[PDB]
């Protein structure tokens, strides 16, 4: 999995003009079960 994460959300009008940061989150993949699936990114050491 890579999509069970929270996707950054912010006012699109401001986002097109300046860096708004991460003021809100929108759901990614979801399921009824109360369990957090790991995301692949947390297992790969970044290039830097």
């Amino acid at each position: 999995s890579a999509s069970h994460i929270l996707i950054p959300a912010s006012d699109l009008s401001w986002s097109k003009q300046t860096d708004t940061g991460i003021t809100h989150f929108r759901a990614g993949m979801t399921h009824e079960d109360e369990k957090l699936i790991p995301t692949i990114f947390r297992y790969i050491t970044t290039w830097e």
């Binding site: 929270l6 991460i22 957090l36 990114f41 947390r42 050491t45 970044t46």
Partner: protein, 460 residues
């Protein structure tokens, strides 16, 4: 029996001398201590002494502020001994009648406040209050009716909504159709504001013992013109029942004495971390968990250990920590103590890879003041109070500091911070030698020169 009476003549004064200063010094803050200290003497005979003390307490002009404390004490004493409340419902009532006959309204105010607060505790019946309000209204002393109504009107409305809404129709007729004086008028209008929005807000500020702490005993009295206050109340009375009174007091006192006397959490946090793409997301998820203050340090420990499982440092952990720290002070203090926990206790369990990650992590948080540089006060660069693990940790931490800030900014931040344990400007010379050795050998010697001036003077 003469000898027994002589003994009682002395026992009465013993009780009086013990209970008088207790009542005379009563305050809402020390009420429990006064209540327990009353019961170390036989109060079942000293009922009248306590009642006389209470009457004198209400008559005192300065004790208007302390009346709620007296009322709560009377409630406690009535729950333990109903006769005290029984006789007080009569003596305070007759004392109010007397003080109203002499028109000393300052003491009448204290008595009416005490009786209203006793009403709130069900020590006295509603009948007493409606008689008092009849007596004041047939004289038109609104200033006391208003004061009584602020305190007990909200209960009087539950118990006697008929007479209560008569007193309101009388009070409102006055406000709307009579030529009141301003200081009266604004206090009557403020009683209307109270009823309008929070009728209990007249008895908020008093000390309020919960109903669990006492047992309800209600006493009532009907005032007749012939009745007079007992001016000899509290005087000695022959005690034909001394022995049984003492035995009962024994049972009461002993009653008073007896009555007065994670793998799943780690997993949860770890999965929160491993399910997040960014540090902002991870921080949001952890913050949404609303972790209790006592668990916050353990959460920081889980974050540190998780970061130490990675092959390298990661900005993800620094951003996560930074967002936690800035969210609330309890997180900042959890991180502060986790830093000193790591350097003082955990470093001996860390291998050189883990120390590299940890040094860079804390160096990053310090380099941005999320962790104050004052945290380095726990560092003590000496051959005795440090170990290879700690020195390797310090090396990586300072290497990160210089990489992020540069020599100049690191130098200025260290100068503006008292770090005698790393840059000793005073004290034993060999601490200066060892410190300059460490910092030059890690390549931070440029920081040392300033210190070396002292090292040179020490040679002469």
């Amino acid at each position: 029996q003469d000898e027994d009476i002589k003994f009682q003549r002395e026992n009465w004064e013993m009780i009086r001398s013990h209970v008088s200063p207790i009542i005379s010094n009563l305050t809402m803050d020390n009420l429990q201590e006064s209540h327990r200290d009353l019961f170390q003497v036989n109060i079942l005979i000293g009922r009248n002494i306590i009642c006389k003390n209470v009457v004198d307490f209400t008559l005192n002009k300065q004790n208007g502020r302390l009346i709620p404390a007296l009322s709560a004490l009377i409630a406690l004493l009535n729950s333990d001994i109903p006769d005290i409340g029984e006789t007080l419902a009569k003596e305070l009532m007759l004392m109010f009648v007397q003080q109203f006959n002499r028109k000393d309204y300052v003491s009448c105010g204290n008595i009416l406040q005490c009786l209203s607060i006793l009403f709130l505790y069900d020590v006295i019946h509603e009948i007493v209050i409606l008689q008092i309000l009849l007596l004041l209204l047939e004289k038109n002393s609104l200033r006391l009716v208003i004061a009584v109504m602020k305190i007990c009107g909200w209960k009087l409305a539950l118990v006697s909504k008929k007479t209560h809404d008569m007193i309101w129709e009388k009070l409102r007729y006055i406000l709307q159709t009579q030529e009141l004086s301003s200081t009266l008028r604004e206090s009557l209008e403020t009683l209307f504001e109270i009823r309008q929005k929070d009728y209990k807000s007249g008895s908020q500020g008093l000390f309020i013992l919960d109903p669990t702490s006492y047992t309800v005993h209600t006493h009532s009295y009907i005032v007749s013109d012939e009745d007079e206050a007992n001016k000899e109340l509290g005087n000695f009375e022959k005690c034909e029942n001394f022995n049984e009174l003492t035995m009962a007091f024994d049972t009461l006192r002993q009653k008073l004495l007896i009555n007065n006397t994670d793998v799943e959490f780690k997993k949860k946090i770890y999965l929160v971390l491993k399910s997040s793409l960014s540090g902002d997301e991870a921080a949001h998820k952890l913050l949404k968990l609303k972790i209790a203050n006592n668990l916050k340090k353990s959460v920081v420990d889980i974050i540190i250990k998780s970061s130490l499982q990675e092959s390298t440092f990661s900005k993800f952990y620094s951003i996560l920590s930074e967002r936690m720290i800035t969210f609330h002070r309890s997180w900042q203090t959890a991180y502060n103590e986790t830093f000193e926990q790591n350097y003082t206790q955990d470093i001996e369990d860390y291998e050189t890879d883990q120390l590299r990650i940890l040094g860079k992590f804390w160096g990053h948080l310090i380099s941005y003041e999320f962790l104050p540089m004052d945290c380095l006060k726990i560092i003590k660069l000496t051959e005795e109070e440090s170990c290879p693990q700690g020195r390797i940790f310090i090396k990586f931490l300072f290497q990160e500091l210089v990489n992020e800030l540069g020599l100049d900014e690191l130098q200025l931040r260290l100068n503006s911070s008292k770090l005698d344990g790393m840059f000793p400007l005073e004290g034993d010379a060999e601490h200066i030698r060892y410190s300059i050795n460490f910092f030059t050998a890690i390549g931070l010697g440029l920081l040392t020169e300033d210190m070396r001036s002292r090292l040179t003077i020490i040679q002469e």
